[PDB]
Design an enzyme around this catalytic site. Structure first.
Site, mmCIF file in Angstrom:
data_model
loop_
_atom_site.group_PDB
_atom_site.id
_atom_site.type_symbol
_atom_site.label_atom_id
_atom_site.label_comp_id
_atom_site.label_asym_id
_atom_site.label_seq_id
_atom_site.Cartn_x
_atom_site.Cartn_y
_atom_site.Cartn_z
ATOM 1 C CE1 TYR A 1 88.038 -9.291 48.916
ATOM 2 C CE2 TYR A 1 88.293 -11.078 50.485
ATOM 3 C CZ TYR A 1 88.371 -9.732 50.182
ATOM 4 O OH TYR A 1 88.773 -8.839 51.132
ATOM 5 C CG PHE B 1 88.874 -15.010 57.458
ATOM 6 C CD1 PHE B 1 89.602 -13.921 57.010
ATOM 7 C CD2 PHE B 1 88.972 -16.204 56.768
ATOM 8 C CE1 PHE B 1 90.404 -14.023 55.887
ATOM 9 C CE2 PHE B 1 89.773 -16.305 55.644
ATOM 10 C CZ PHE B 1 90.488 -15.214 55.208
ATOM 11 C CG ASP B 2 87.616 -10.240 54.436
ATOM 12 O OD1 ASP B 2 86.550 -9.629 54.250
ATOM 13 O OD2 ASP B 2 88.733 -9.759 54.182
ATOM 14 C CB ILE C 1 98.532 -13.158 50.332
ATOM 15 C CG1 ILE C 1 97.091 -13.456 49.931
ATOM 16 C CG2 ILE C 1 98.605 -12.578 51.732
ATOM 17 C CD1 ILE C 1 96.479 -14.588 50.710
ATOM 18 C CE1 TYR D 1 98.292 -11.902 56.117
ATOM 19 C CE2 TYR D 1 96.538 -13.500 55.837
ATOM 20 C CZ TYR D 1 96.993 -12.200 55.749
ATOM 21 O OH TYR D 1 96.165 -11.213 55.302
ATOM 22 C CG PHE E 1 90.610 -16.726 49.322
ATOM 23 C CD1 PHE E 1 90.082 -15.685 50.062
ATOM 24 C CD2 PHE E 1 91.917 -17.115 49.557
ATOM 25 C CE1 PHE E 1 90.849 -15.041 51.017
ATOM 26 C CE2 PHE E 1 92.682 -16.470 50.514
ATOM 27 C CZ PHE E 1 92.146 -15.436 51.243
#
Lengths: 107, 49, 98, 783
Positions: free
Chosen positions: A26, A36-37, A56, A82, A99
């Site tokens: 992912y 960010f990831d 999540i 979040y 995502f």
């Protein structure tokens, strides 16, 4: 309340089932295109199990509707990822997440 | 505020040498067509698509 | 004024320099210094007949390394001192008239 | 922007794509596997020429299909659309190429490439001298007749040599032609056409300014005809007898006159066919009104230019025999230099430069602070030698050396012990005219020197700093025995180079600009803070006047999603509208001012700016039935012309609502009908374009209005709720510069191109990956 869009087709016959573990690659980014990831940077697929609250809600609901080998995009609202707290130093409060998830193998 | 960093791939472009346009008194036709066929693609050769 | 003699000597000099290998560089300074004083030609010849060992070592500077690459690959003892003395004499005399 | 299509997915092996272009109404549409796509690109600018293109990264393999002898289409085109292969020009050969590259591989090393000349869409419209003016010289009527007669004799001879014979009805297969008769025996309409054509040769000579008049009254009765053998006789007794013009010799002016008469005649015929509706093609199609040579004379094949040219050369010789005698600036250069860290301040160094073309080029030594937009040698920061015509450049030019030839190599040497520079050509030291053996002398070390070179349009060169000593071709001849050393000796890696990139960018205005000044004014009780511009050389003998593009250094960002004297505290605290205005002082023409906004991707820098030159495009989406349900307008420049509100000062105000994406303007407190709309996540910079005409030009103002916040509340997070106008130091004006330095990568992608076959077309390929580490500037949105 999650939007799902298809990028590449999958087998269309195999779906996640209770008691299985999903292995996925992912890439995550904010609504403004700020990454960010990404699991591909570490060159290591991520493993998680359904029903044990390890990720999540948005990610689990998005993955539950994907077939083996399918590549799709997921969108999660702030109330499902979040909320008004966020991840200190990574995600600001009230942020929408996008995502790019691909399902590799099921077990 | 602070400067960001990342890794990205290089990209390039290719064209055939044909040119077409629109103007008063021009001698060129006004409609054109062409196709492209793709043989192989590797979806993830590196960390970036 | 610039005479014809000096001009032709300058024209002919590069081959003379190419005649001797770079390793013999230091002996040229030594001969020039000995020519600073009136060291008879034969006196210098016999003198350098013994100090030959002072020639530059292959072990040494980076500069000698790539230069020697080139000196070897050209199509081709006492002759060495002869060459050094011959070159040094004209070098010193030309310098004296800068 | 997402689009809808059956089986919507990313391009995968075995997919086929087709693109259609319609220029009558600017429109572009796509199909995939024969399925129509639900989106069209309409209403776009038409200032140039279009071409197909494909972009990719490493790890793909694609084929081009163009029809004809090349790739065969898998789906028949829609009606009225032509295959792309029909657009090849007569003088060109089909191939695949990169786009505006500045480098390529070579037999011994990479070559440096200068800018490239390109065609313009106005080069396909002919321009004949043909005017309504008529000559009808009574004194040239006899020669019109005699000229037509000899042209006929010559034509008939040309036919008969090629096996044509007489018959009353034309037959191309049997080569029978009814015009193989005496001129006087042609049908009257054919005679009249021939006389008209002869007359138009004469009239075109006169239109070209030729003086045509009788000079030798004896020449005509001394003319003889060529006597052909009986094998040139037709069955009707006609045998051609053209004049023997073997004694006639065109003067240079007459040769030039023939070269001019034929080009104009071809252009007039071309424009006549264009008026008749014919167009260019790679294949002739009479029903489709397509002809293979329907192009202006500048771009024609030499075979036909020479053919048609000879009929007009023979005509001129006949006439003489009859006794009458008749008698952008920045994209034009590119600079390459070494990196500053390699600066040199002592010793003796050497490097080589090989010229693959004999055009405009330069090479030499330069100082670290060289400017990128100044031709080499026109200032004190370079010492170069121009090889196109022997010259040496430093603060000017002077004759030196001799011009070079293709394949020649130049050697550059610098000696910091004597402060001299020497140039050599093919191992031979170049000599000055005044007997000097050194190009320059008495230079000072200063900060150092770097190798440098420049290339003009269409030029190519090879540069060798000498990392490999064996590569040098003339180092041994001159330099090795003098104590000079290669520049790049004893280096593990190749030397890095920088080049000048012509992509305009915004930069702060220097505090010491010789022509422009910007002053910061603080706010008062009656006025807000301001930034005013002044011209500090207006009216002097050496003032500079030209278009000026300005913007502020911080943007305003729209919200991520849209909805659906005193000030009231709640209204102002809950508002999302911000304001700013511009004042133009008296003496500055409002017709030369544009005010508005601009996106971070504006790079035009046009010297004749008009609102009609702004880039724009419309994208429309629909359904399978074709019902449109969304249309969007996109651009990069949202401005209003100052002439629309046309002494005394003029003030223009701008408004924006970040929660709805709406923009409006007001002039002297009166609204205007102009307005725009944008999308949720856009950035905008305040901007102003002006052509100065006075000492005092423009003044930004950062005030506010009733129940409207100032833009300093939108620019800065801290002041999001402070209605007091401000102007912190970070906010300043910037101007647009046309050229900047940039760094050349160390490695490039490898691409393979070849013609797969008659049925498969052309192929492209790339396998080896490459990547780099980027640095991003968040506010400007660039890396």
């Amino acid at each position: 309340g999650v939007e799902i869009e298809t990028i590449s087709p999958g087998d269309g016959r195999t779906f996640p089932k209770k008691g299985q573990t999903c292995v996925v690659h992912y890439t995550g980014m904010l609504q403004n295109g700020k990454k960010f990831d990404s699991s591909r940077d570490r060159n290591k697929p991520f493993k998680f199990r359904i029903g044990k609250q390890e990720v999540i809600k948005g990610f689990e609901e998005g993955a539950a509707q994907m077939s083996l080998g399918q590549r799709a995009k997921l969108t999660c609202t702030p109330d499902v990822a979040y909320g008004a707290t966020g991840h200190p130093g990574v995600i600001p409060p009230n942020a929408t997440l996008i995502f790019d998830v691909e399902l590799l193998n099921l077990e | 505020l602070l400067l960001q960093t990342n890794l990205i791939n290089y990209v390039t472009s290719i064209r055939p040498n044909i040119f077409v346009g629109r103007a008063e008194g021009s001698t060129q036709y006004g409609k054109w067509y062409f196709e492209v066929m793709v043989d192989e693609v590797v979806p993830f050769l590196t960390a970036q698509a | 004024q610039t005479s014809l003699i000096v001009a032709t000597l300058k024209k002919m000099l590069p081959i003379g320099l190419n005649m001797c290998a770079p390793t013999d560089q230091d002996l040229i300074m030594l001969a020039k210094t000995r020519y600073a004083l009136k060291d008879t030609d034969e006196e210098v010849r016999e003198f350098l007949q013994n100090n030959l060992h002072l020639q530059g070592k292959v072990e040494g500077s980076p500069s000698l390394r790539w230069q020697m690459a080139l000196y070897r690959g050209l199509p081709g003892p006492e002759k060495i001192v002869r060459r050094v003395q011959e070159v040094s004499a004209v070098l010193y005399h030309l310098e004296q008239t800068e | 922007r997402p689009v809808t299509s059956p089986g919507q997915h990313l391009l995968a092996p075995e997919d086929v794509v087709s693109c259609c272009l319609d220029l009558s109404v600017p429109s572009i549409s796509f199909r995939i596997n024969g399925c129509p796509v639900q989106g069209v690109f309409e209403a776009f600018n038409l200032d140039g020429l279009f071409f197909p293109v494909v972009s990719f990264s490493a790890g793909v393999k694609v084929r081009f299909l163009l029809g004809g002898r090349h790739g065969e289409f898998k789906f028949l085109p829609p009606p009225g659309y032509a295959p792309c292969h029909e657009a090849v020009l007569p003088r060109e050969r089909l191939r695949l190429e990169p786009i505006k590259e500045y480098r390529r591989e070579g037999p011994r090393g990479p070559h440096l490439v200068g800018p490239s000349r390109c065609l313009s869409h106005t080069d396909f419209v002919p321009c004949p001298v043909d005017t309504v003016q008529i000559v009808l010289p009574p004194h040239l009527e006899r020669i019109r007749e005699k000229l037509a007669e000899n042209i006929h004799e010559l034509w008939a001879l040309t036919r008969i040599e090629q096996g044509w014979t007489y018959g009353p009805v034309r037959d191309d297969n049997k080569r029978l032609h009814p015009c193989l008769v005496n001129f006087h025996s042609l049908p009257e309409p054919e005679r009249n056409y021939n006389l008209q054509m002869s007359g138009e040769t004469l009239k075109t000579l006169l239109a070209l300014g030729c003086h045509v008049g009788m000079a030798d009254e004896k020449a005509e009765d001394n003319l003889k005809k060529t006597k052909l053998p009986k094998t040139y006789m037709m069955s009707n007794g006609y045998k051609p007898a053209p004049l023997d013009l073997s004694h006639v010799r065109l003067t240079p002016a007459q040769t030039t006159l023939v070269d001019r008469l034929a080009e104009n005649g071809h252009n007039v015929w071309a424009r006549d066919r264009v008026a008749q509706g014919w167009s260019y093609s790679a294949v002739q199609d009479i029903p489709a009104r397509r002809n293979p040579r329907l192009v202006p004379y500048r771009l024609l094949d030499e075979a036909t230019k020479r053919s048609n040219r000879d009929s007009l050369c023979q005509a001129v010789r006949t006439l003489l025999g009859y006794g009458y005698n008749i008698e952008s600036r920045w994209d034009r250069v590119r600079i390459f230099r070494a990196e500053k860290s390699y600066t040199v301040q002592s010793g003796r160094w050497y490097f080589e430069f090989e010229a693959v073309t004999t055009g405009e080029m330069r090479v030499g030594w330069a100082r670290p602070e060289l400017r990128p937009d100044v031709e080499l040698g026109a200032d004190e920061l370079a010492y170069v030698f121009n090889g196109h015509r022997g010259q040496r450049w430093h603060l000017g030019s002077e004759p030196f050396g001799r011009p070079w030839q293709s394949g020649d190599v130049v050697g550059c040497m610098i000696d910091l012990t004597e402060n001299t520079i020497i140039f050599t050509l093919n191992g031979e030291v170049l000599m000055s005219d005044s007997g000097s053996e050194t190009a320059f002398r008495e230079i000072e070390i200063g900060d150092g020197f770097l190798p440098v070179c420049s290339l003009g349009p269409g030029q190519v060169g090879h540069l060798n700093l000498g990392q490999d000593v064996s590569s040098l071709r003339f180092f041994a001849i001159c330099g090795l025995q003098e104590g000079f050393e290669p520049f790049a000796i004893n280096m593990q890696r190749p030397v890095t180079t920088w080049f000048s990139k012509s992509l305009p960018q915004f930069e702060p205005v220097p505090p010491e600009h010789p022509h422009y000044e910007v002053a910061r004014m603080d706010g008062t009780v009656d006025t807000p803070p301001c930034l005013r511009l002044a011209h500090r050389t207006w009216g002097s003998q050496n003032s500079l006047v030209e278009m000026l593009f300005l913007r502020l250094s911080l943007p305003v960002q729209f919200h991520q999603h849209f909805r659906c004297n005193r000030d009231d505290p709640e209204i102002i605290l809950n508002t999302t509208t911000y304001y700013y205005s511009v004042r133009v002082f008296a003496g500055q023409e409002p017709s030369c001012v544009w005010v508005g906004w601009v996106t971070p991707d504006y790079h035009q820098h046009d010297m004749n700016f008009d609102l009609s030159k702004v880039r724009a495009v419309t994208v429309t989406m629909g359904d399978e039935q074709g019902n449109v349900h969304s249309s969007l307008k996109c651009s990069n420049c949202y401005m209003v012309w100052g002439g629309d509100f046309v002494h005394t000062d003029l003030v223009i105000g701008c408004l924006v609502d970040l929660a709805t994406g709406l923009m409006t303007f007001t002039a002297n407190g009166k609204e205007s009908n102009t307005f725009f709309q944008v999308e949720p996540n856009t950035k905008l910079f305040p901007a102003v374009f002006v052509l100065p005409t006075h000492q005092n030009v423009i003044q930004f103002e950062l005030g506010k209005q009733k129940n409207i916040m100032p833009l300093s509340a939108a620019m800065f997070l801290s002041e999001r709720k402070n209605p007091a106008p401000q102007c912190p130091p970070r906010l300043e004006v910037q101007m647009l510069m046309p050229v900047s330095w940039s760094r050349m990568p160390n490695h490039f992608l490898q691409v393979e191109t070849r013609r797969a076959g008659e049925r498969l077309g052309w192929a492209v390929q790339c396998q080896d990956p490459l990547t780099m580490m980027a640095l991003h500037i968040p506010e400007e949105n660039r890396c």
